[PDB]
Design a protein around this ligand. Structure first.
Ligand SMILES: Nc1ncnc2c1ncn2[C@@H]1O[C@H](COP(=O)(O)OP(=O)(O)O)[C@@H](O)[C@H]1O
Ligand SMILES: [Ca+2]
Length: 340
């Protein structure tokens, strides 16, 4: 399978095999063909990739060329977080793959993106009604298009929502060709395709692809062998929880459950220091009502005292509304403030 690509893809809604879906009577100029498949290519990650989300840029800092996972169940602000990242990230180009959701949920995500952001996005969209084959190819189409723009010297953000639903489509395609169930309903081809997909993002001499893949968590206790494999491959993971989202704490990122394997390689030692102390002050906060309620009060307990003192500053730092905008300078300055 070869798809047609070019700069004219920018600002466009594109199907799972790369074809314009909008109603224009004049067709875009897409003069190049590129295969969907890319045999394997090495660079290190040493530059910070800024998302413009304080909790992440401050505490779980990304790197140019990193593979990042966002794990979220239903109704925890996944889409809002993803919108914020598109609107705030330091990328020249964003290639989005929106895979497996109904047309309503796609449009609700798109309404989060203003004109200035859309003008630098390729939007690869394959809703749940589309054939499994098309939903599967969407992940390759999107990655190839990101490769195309990387090859132009662009710092590209590849955003795939979701790898979970890519894998379901790849599964249905595989089982159809005769493959048996090996683990959790998934055939062998799906598993072999994951590293091949993810090995294609990374830093580069010309440009880069930094990639974010979402993993949808189900509200059951059924194993997800796709999530397992992705966890082992990623250079970072961001975990959203229903517990935080129920507090109207957004983004609903559980800092203790999240991590960046590249952060220490991309921030100053002092920034790493303040982040660790911020994380401790988050983890050791306990509602003061729990002690007042039993005869108030410190000791003698110094760390947990700061946590109370800093609660508002910390919560106002990690919580962040959809149109709150935060440069890397201001995020870092704010971070030092919260741990004083
Ligand atoms: N960072 C945020 N700032 C303000 N409101 C938010 C934020 N995240 C979620 N919300 C509120 O909760 C709702 C859920 O967000 P959304 O991204 O649509 O969740 P889901 O991943 O279920 O689509 C939003 O419509 C919004 O009103
Ligand atoms: Ca598991």
């Amino acid at each position: 399978h070869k798809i047609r690509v070019g700069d004219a893809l920018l600002g466009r809604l594109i199907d799972g095999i790369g074809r314009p879906m909008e109603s224009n009577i004049v067709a875009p100029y897409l003069p190049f063909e590129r295969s969907l498949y890319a045999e394997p290519p090495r660079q290190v990650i040493d530059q910070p990739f800024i998302l413009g989300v304080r909790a992440i840029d401050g505490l779980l800092t990304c790197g140019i060329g990193q593979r990042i996972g966002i794990f979220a169940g239903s109704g925890v602000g996944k889409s809002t977080l993803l919108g914020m990242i598109c609107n705030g990230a330091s990328a020249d180009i964003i290639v989005l793959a929106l895979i497996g959701e109904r047309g309503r949920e796609v449009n609700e995500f798109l309404a989060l993106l203003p004109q200035s952001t859309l003008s630098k996005c390729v939007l690869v969209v394959t809703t749940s009604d589309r054939p499994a084959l098309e939903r599967m190819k969407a992940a390759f189409t999107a990655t190839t298009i990101a490769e195309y723009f990387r090859d132009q010297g662009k710092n590209v953000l590849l955003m795939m929502d979701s790898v979970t639903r890519y894998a379901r489509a790849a599964r249905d395609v595989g089982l159809a060709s005769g493959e048996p169930d090996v683990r959790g309903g998934f055939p062998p081809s799906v598993f072999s395709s994951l590293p091949k997909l993810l090995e294609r993002a990374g830093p580069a001499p010309k440009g880069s692809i930094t990639a974010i893949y979402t993993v949808l968590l189900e509200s059951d206790n059924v194993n997800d062998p796709i999530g397992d494999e992705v966890r082992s491959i990623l250079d970072g993971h961001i975990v959203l929880t229903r517990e935080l989202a129920e507090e109207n704490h957004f983004p609903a990122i559980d800092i203790g459950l999240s991590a960046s394997r590249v952060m220490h390689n991309v921030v100053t030692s002092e920034h790493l220091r303040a982040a660790a102390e911020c994380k401790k002050l988050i983890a050791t906060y306990k509602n003061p009502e729990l002690l007042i309620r039993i005869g108030e009060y410190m000791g003698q307990d110094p760390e947990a005292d700061k946590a109370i003192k800093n609660r508002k500053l910390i919560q106002n730092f990690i919580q962040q509304s959809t149109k709150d905008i935060s440069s890397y300078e201001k995020t870092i300055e704010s971070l030092f403030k919260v741990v004083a």
